[PDB]
Ligand SMILES: Nc1ncnc2c1ncn2[C@@H]1O[C@H](COP(=O)(O)OP(=O)(O)OP(=O)(O)O)[C@@H](O)[C@H]1O
């Protein structure tokens with residue numbers, strides 16, 4: 001007998017990349033579902049008995065150690081930000097990226113990226129700290145998105161940046177290379193362009209964009225009081241997890257009540 | 268000469284608990300400000316040279332290790348949640364706590380607490396994991412608040428909870444005692460009551476409420492599919508930091524562009 005779309009969808013929820021099971025081999029749905037439920041319960045029990053760390057939390061901690069050890073100051077800045085930051089970032093209020101903003105009340109929004117808060121920290125810290133200024137942040141960011149296998153509306157960004165000396169393309173590429181080598185992720189760099197920053201160095205794993213990176217200065221700097229060379233890159237943590245664990249859909253990696261470390265919680 | 272309110276406010280921004288300086292000794296504002304600016308620049312330079320970890324991030328990591336090591340599963344659940352969770356939690360839509368909710372779009376809000384997402388995880392995990400189920404989450408929560416020295420609109424909650432065996436008042440108190448002993452924070456337990464959960468065991472450091480804790484079952488359980496004994500407690504991380512560092516105002520501990528590890532970034 002043949003599987004309905006609802007049945008295939010249920011088996012896909014329970015399937016994991018490490019499995020090799022044919023869903024349409026002719027084996028009945030009831031046996032495929034029971035087999036996968038048993039494998040997933042075993043996987044979750046082993047997590048609970050032996051590791052207990054959340055993939056997103058653990059990856060944030062690993063990345064934090066990497067950057068702290070390399071001289072970058074760990075920032076934790078507001079997630080709920082003034083709506084005025086959007087227009088000030090060059091997100092023209094009828095850009096499709098402008099349509100991606102979650103508004104809160106009348107004058108606030110959920111940050112769609114970490115850059116503006118980090119630009120404010122670079123400016124303020126440069127009055128107190130020796131050259132170069134090196135900072136980074138990891139945390140939640142928010143964008144309205146069309147349904148896709150590589151986009152979440154609530155995701156987790158890493159942005160590291162440096163201002164002052166050493167803010168060259170070669171140093172930016174070297175940091176990205178050291179970082180992704182530390183995580184074991186192969187990549188290439190390709191040129192792209194975006195509305196906020198202009199030309200970017202996009203960090204690609206196959207056709208998947210892991211990061212956009214920028215070498216300043218750029219015209220936007222004046223609007224933020226940035227008056228020195230700078231470099232920076234933003235990475236999505238859920239995309240890194242998707243690569244590391246071979247997930248078919250980024251939802252496996254997200255903050256979710258529906259998956260724990262890529263395992264369905266609907267068991 | 269005498270200091271204006273604006274001048275005193277500026278010196279208070281630059282003052283730290285470890286200082287002992289009289290602001291109104293007669294020394295001119297210019298010298299008090301220069302002295303404090305020099306101390307704070309030194310403090311920030313030492314952080315940058317030697318530690319580099321954010322107080323909120325570091326405390327989250329320390330708490331995470333404590334609970335993971337004691338058998339609790341680390342959860343990271345959505346911050347942007349359905350507005351329907353508010354009414355379902357017994358937050359009657361004309362309660363003053365209901366007026367504290369940040370709404371997003373028409374059907375979402377920023378979570379004001381971690382409990383609903385954790386209740387969903389307890390229910391789902393109980394179908395797969397052995398008794399007892401032990402989980403915790405640390406992350407941002409959001410409430411509209413009147414200006415006060417102990418409240419932030421964007422704060423960080425820890426909630427740990429357990430369901431099944433061992434869900435007694437004595438075990439809940441023992442976990443709280445082990446936890447606060449680990450952090451070096453003295454406390455007492457006093458009874459209180461709240462609208463969502465009913466009677467609480469409030470964890471007090473002097474007059475400062477560090478946590479509300481609850482021993483279930485409670486009537487709300489049925490609305491969430493919870494059908495076993497449970498215990499749980501919610502703690503504000505910024506309040507823990509305020510105690511640890513003797514901050515006069517909780518803003519020193521918050522996500523902020525205005526303070527880094529309690530040091531003014533306006534230098
Ligand atoms: N909606 C999203 N969900 C998950 N990760 C995201 C999302 N948007 C951006 N990221 C991650 O943040 C990084 C930096 O953000 P950036 O603004 O460059 O994204 P982007 O160019 O809009 O990505 P895409 O072109 O894939 O939409 C991206 O390279 C990606 O890893």
Ligand SMILES: Nc1ncnc2c1ncn2[C@@H]1O[C@H](COP(=O)(O)OP(=O)(O)OP(=O)(O)O)[C@@H](O)[C@H]1O
Pocket residue numbers: 380410412417418419420422423424461476477478479501502503504505506
């Ligand atoms: N606005 C806030 N800012 C900082 N921490 C908070 C805030 N609201 C709650 N917390 C922390 O979260 C814990 C659990 O939340 P709970 O709902 O019990 O707070 P609460 O009883 O409303 O606190 P309070 O009575 O001080 O307003 C509190 O004990 C406190 O440590």
Ligand SMILES: N[C@@H](CCCCNC(=O)OCc1ccc(C2(C(F)(F)F)N=N2)cc1)C(=O)O
Pocket residue numbers: 088089113114115116118119120122159160161162194196197200212213214218220221222224226230231232233234
């Ligand atoms: N999410 C991103 C990833 C690139 C990040 C690059 N920025 C960065 O690393 O932070 C340092 C920095 C410096 C200057 C600015 C800025 C402004 F505030 F306007 F944004 N121009 N002045 C901002 C951030 C993207 O959409 O490509």
Ligand SMILES: N[C@@H](CCCCNC(=O)OCc1ccc(C2(C(F)(F)F)N=N2)cc1)C(=O)O
Pocket residue numbers: 355356380381382383385386387389426427428429461463464467479480481485487488489491493497498499500501
């Ligand atoms: N912030 C809090 C701090 C007390 C937390 C206690 N809860 C907890 O630890 O999580 C476990 C849990 C179990 C059952 C429920 C629930 C519901 F979903 F409705 F909320 N009743 N079913 C919810 C959480 C407070 O305002 O007192």
Ligand SMILES: [K+]
Pocket residue numbers: 016017018019020
């Ligand atoms: K496979």
Ligand SMILES: [K+]
Pocket residue numbers: 180181184185186187
């Ligand atoms: K690599």
Ligand SMILES: [K+]
Pocket residue numbers: 283284285286287
């Ligand atoms: K003092």
Ligand SMILES: [K+]
Pocket residue numbers: 447448451452453454
């Ligand atoms: K104690």
Ligand SMILES: [Mg+2]
Pocket residue numbers: none
């Ligand atoms: Mg995009």
Ligand SMILES: [Mg+2]
Pocket residue numbers: 209
């Ligand atoms: Mg892109």
Ligand SMILES: [Mg+2]
Pocket residue numbers: 194200202209211212
């Ligand atoms: Mg990009």
Ligand SMILES: [Mg+2]
Pocket residue numbers: none
């Ligand atoms: Mg309150």
Ligand SMILES: [Mg+2]
Pocket residue numbers: 476
């Ligand atoms: Mg209270």
Ligand SMILES: [Mg+2]
Pocket residue numbers: 461467469476478479
């Ligand atoms: Mg309370």
